[PDB]
Write a protein that binds this ligand. Structure first.
Ligand SMILES: Cc1onc(-c2cccnc2Cl)c1C(=O)N1CCN(c2ccc([N+](=O)[O-])cc2Cl)CC1
Ligand SMILES: Cc1onc(-c2cccnc2Cl)c1C(=O)N1CCN(c2ccc([N+](=O)[O-])cc2Cl)CC1
Ligand SMILES: Cc1onc(-c2cccnc2Cl)c1C(=O)N1CCN(c2ccc([N+](=O)[O-])cc2Cl)CC1
Lengths: 430, 430, 423
């Protein structure tokens, strides 16, 4: 707890000090250093370094300008290592990768990659950290969704360190499944010699089941490097105060930060804001209802967002680019979870699924058809188990949201009530 | 294109000139000639002729009066042929039949005819042109729904020109199915010698499948004969301008026309208007949402309509009949389609059917149960195919509605969102 | 002109640059530097150093005369710490001039005084001052700039309300320097929009040895200004930390220009984050309202139009769950928390110095009011009473003019939509 916050606090302090340093080298104004487009470029540089470069955006003569500078990968590596007091500090590096992953999960649908892997494009909610490199951190492995892990394994399926790297991924995936039957099936894929089609068939099954019998996937609020550096510069001490990725800390920091974004002509600044907000709290596949309740303003589906990606291609001309303040604050806050929700328990039920007519009145007589009709080796155990599940089943009982003043999480607020961020395109209306 | 509009333009000009002629014979005032009840009677006469007669409604001494005149079927036939410059002009005749069919599809449910044919009364959406005579036009065959065609075939099943007339109907029905499996099944019904129960069983199957794997059925805006004649009389040239049944033309004409209807005491003139509007654009079984969006005012289900049929039986007394203006104009317009929508393609999917919890918050965890659970000879190919379909699947991508000023259909408007016109009676609430 | 806009941007550059220097001297954190409480102390320091009267006096009557102070605040060992810091006045004066390029630039000092005056009008209704002078405590709404000095510069004089001038005059009447009396009368007359009020204001101006009749005039002349309102300038003057922070981040007010009545101050607060210390039983939202109102001279406005511009409700004073911004020496620092001040707005509006078809002929027999623009048609001591009785609380002003989007930099498309100290 205290020990966790200590190290997390150190790596964020590292990223902070690096950014500030990196910002001075480029002779950037404070405002300019707080432009999200600049942060990502600087973030890109240090990851690429471990020549390199990219677009830097300045405010020259009343108009936005785009230079693109280059640095020695040795020069960058030296700046990173030294900002993290001697050490190579891989931890801060993989933290920036996860922030990039989170934003990629919010910005882009990845059906094109799904169809080549033989996977249902509707499995997107299982795809957390798919753009994240194979053999990422321990932190990376935690953040990767069930679908991400299935997709990595099929690519393998399609130099006997291959054997262990295959076994390493099966165990990662097994750790994520919350039922014994799903876990056992992963053993059968892992135990297999010369992996082929049966294994493919099985992994596609397991992916599908993870939509109802959800896996344990970690979520980490990871902010652009400018937010961290800005704080360090303003006099916040991440090592003395400690820090959390899953507590109030990131919400609290975003409440005291001001980030900017370059915005295109037809784009809506409010919509750009939602995208980066979603990315910041790793909520691309979180129910839109709960996101909305937390943020305070409506969190609208991807297809209704009047916005393109955060990054700006070298194609388009800067002469029409303007700068908006990204709204990243929130009405409430909530603890980020590793849980997938209830996948069994079985204990009791408690509820009502039909009515008994009391009054002679013309009307239909409602009943939960799926549930009533439902009740009439390891594969069937799963089928039988996910068939028992209802969309109405409640997870995270007792758990709620908190006021920004309730930093001890003493008094939770349980909310009362579309849901899919990616369920709103030209092919389907979900 | 130009050639199509040329002939369509001619037959509408024919119907026009006939009506004007027919109106003078009966010494009818222009207003009286634009009474929908009078148009249908005149329409009835020329169809019956190919003695005859029916009720004609006049404005005498401040009250509505009902005479019923008679004509020689030779006299009528002469008036029709000569209004269409020499030719027998069957094309204009079958056009009036389709207008009658459209209005019958909007006015009356036909479950009584469905139960005798051994068909599910819920198949009404497949029943376009069921009141239309067997061996109608080529135009008639196009307008007939899948259920209409199945019902005709069972009646056959229940003089070896019978053999071809059976084969002719199987090929009509086959043309309508958009999948190969459905088409193949029709071959098996057609190839059969001595048609009996297996064929019945099969046709009931095919009808059912056509609710999800919809067939290609044509739709034609066909207006009462008074609307056409009124235009010709006012100086519109249908041959010079050409005409379309599926383009902007009928919408444009309705925007420049004023039709009247006799309305009963308790009836709502707004509701009478919707019925004739639906009939005019062949939209009895079109989604109520899209109808509403096009019309501009709400298109209400049949069971919520405070109106009886357009026609007035010789029973009821005229002394309480009054005359209302039928509102048949529209906010937008749309192209009438021959398509049934997507019945396969299969190519990709793109969407989201579940959520991954990000925040520890008490709530249910939504998922598309039908779709997720779904994925666990020619008959089974169809079952397997319609089981893959979801109510959420989007058809007519890119296609939208148009402003009445956008006659070239250059800039479409894609709308964002009950649905069943006949899903609102004392037995069921759909 | 751009020049008018560039000289205003020059002084904000000065204030900004001065505040930055001051913070480095006080070894303050950036966060600590953006605490409204420190900003005030620092602001209070400069004005004290240039308070020649107090300095001339101290040169005669011995304290530590060369120094000046106030409480600075820091966060130490997880808790806020108040400390009385004493600073050498000459060094403050040097840093001011240096941050204003050798110039003593008293317009920069006056700006900060108007900010404090705006803050004072937001916090306290000043009934005791009013009754002592012999005027109605209800005249509350004409008291803008009353907490300012008598000689306060051109900007300061422009900001002062009608009742402020009246109070100054009555103080003098009840009390070589006939020039000060006559000058203040001109400054009073210039505020009056009607010619009838302007005439009576000259009768008082042109008088030797003013007494009863002159005192009685001003009191009625003030009473009239409640209905027949005066031309009182409203300027958006922000805490020095706001300006300091912007300069520090790289905003160039001289180059970019700046106004106190345009969109500028609204834009700045949109890109600012100001903190306040907050007592245990205080609503941070209500403190924020208070400072927001003080920022935009909004104290005596209609609450409705203030709410409409703001976005959230602008609750009246006696229903506001917060006390003053400053913290007294007797207050317990161990209970102090610091919070963000939400000072952003939904729309913006120009800040005024000010205080076709005329009728309708009915066509349809329908129950309704048959409206007519009362002023235009009808405008064709006793005259004052007549004018006051003629006017109605439902008659509209600033016709056509509305509010603008934050995105609408120019005055393109306006949007056409109560007592803060109400009993
Ligand atoms: C004024 C003012 O002056 N010094 C401070 C100040 C500075 C440092 C520590 N504590 C304080 Cl109080 C201050 C202030 O009120 N702050 C600054 C830091 N804030 C913050 C709180 C939590 C998180 N987090 O969890 O990431 C991030 C941030 Cl930046 C809270 C708001
Ligand atoms: C006045 C006025 O005088 N002559 C005309 C006039 C007459 C003939 C042709 N063009 C024109 Cl402009 C006119 C006019 O404005 N009309 C009349 C015909 N209209 C119409 C347009 C389309 C369709 N259609 O597609 O079936 C039907 C109809 Cl009736 C449009 C409105
Ligand atoms: C990113 C980013 O990088 N450089 C700038 C930048 C910096 C300086 C000038 N212009 C710009 Cl655009 C920038 C940005 O978008 N800003 C900073 C300044 N802002 C601002 C706008 C108006 C007023 N005012 O009227 O007082 C005050 C302020 Cl501080 C608007 C938001």
């Amino acid at each position: 707890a205290t020990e966790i916050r200590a190290s997390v606090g150190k790596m964020i302090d590292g990223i902070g000090r690096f950014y500030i340093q990196m910002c001075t080298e480029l002779k950037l104004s404070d405002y300019e250093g707080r432009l999200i487009q600049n942060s990502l470029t600087i973030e890109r540089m240090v990851l690429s370094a471990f020549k390199t470069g990219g677009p830097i955006y300045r405010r020259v003569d009343g108009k936005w300008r785009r230079e693109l500078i280059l640095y020695d990968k040795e020069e960058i590596r030296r700046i990173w290592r030294q900002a993290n007091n001697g050490d190579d500090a891989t931890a801060g590096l993989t933290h920036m990768m996860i922030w990039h992953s989170n934003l990629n999960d919010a910005t882009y649908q990845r059906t094109r990659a799904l169809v080549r892997t033989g996977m249902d494009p509707r499995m997107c909610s299982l795809m957390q950290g798919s753009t994240l490199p194979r053999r990422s951190g321990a932190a990376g492995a935690a953040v990767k969704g069930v679908g991400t892990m299935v997709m990595e394994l099929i690519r393998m399926i399609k130099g006997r360190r291959t054997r262990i790297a295959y076994e390493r991924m099966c165990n990662i995936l097994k750790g994520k499944f919350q039922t014994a039957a799903q876990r056992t099936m992963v053993d059968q894929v892992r135990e297999s010699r010369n992996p082929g089609n049966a294994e493919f068939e099985d992994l596609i099954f397991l992916a599908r089941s993870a939509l109802i019998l959800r896996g344990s996937v970690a979520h980490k609020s990871c902010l652009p490097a400018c937010v961290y550096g800005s704080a360090v510069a303003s006099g916040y001490d991440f090592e003395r105060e400690g820090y959390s990725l899953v507590g109030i800390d990131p919400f609290r920091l975003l409440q005291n930060s001001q980030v900017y974004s370059l915005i295109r002509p037809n784009e809506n600044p409010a919509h750009k804001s939602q995208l980066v907000w979603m990315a910041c709290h790793s909520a691309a596949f979180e129910d839109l209802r709960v996101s909305s309740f937390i943020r305070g303003t409506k969190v609208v589906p991807r297809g209704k967002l009047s916005t393109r990606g955060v990054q700006i291609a070298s194609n388009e001309n800067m002469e029409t680019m303007e700068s908006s303040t990204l709204e990243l604050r929130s009405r409430y806050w909530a603890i980020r979870t590793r849980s997938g929700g209830n996948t069994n328990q079985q204990r009791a039920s408690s509820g009502q699924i039909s009515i008994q007519p009391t009054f002679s009145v013309q009307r239909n007589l409602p009943f939960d058809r799926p549930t009533i009709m439902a009740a009439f080796d390891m594969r069937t155990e799963i089928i039988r188990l996910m068939e028992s599940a209802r969309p109405e089943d409640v997870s995270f009982q007792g758990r709620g949201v908190f006021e920004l003043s309730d930093e001890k999480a003493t008094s939770p607020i349980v909310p009362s009530f579309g849901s899919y961020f990616f369920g709103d395109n030209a092919e389907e209306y979900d």
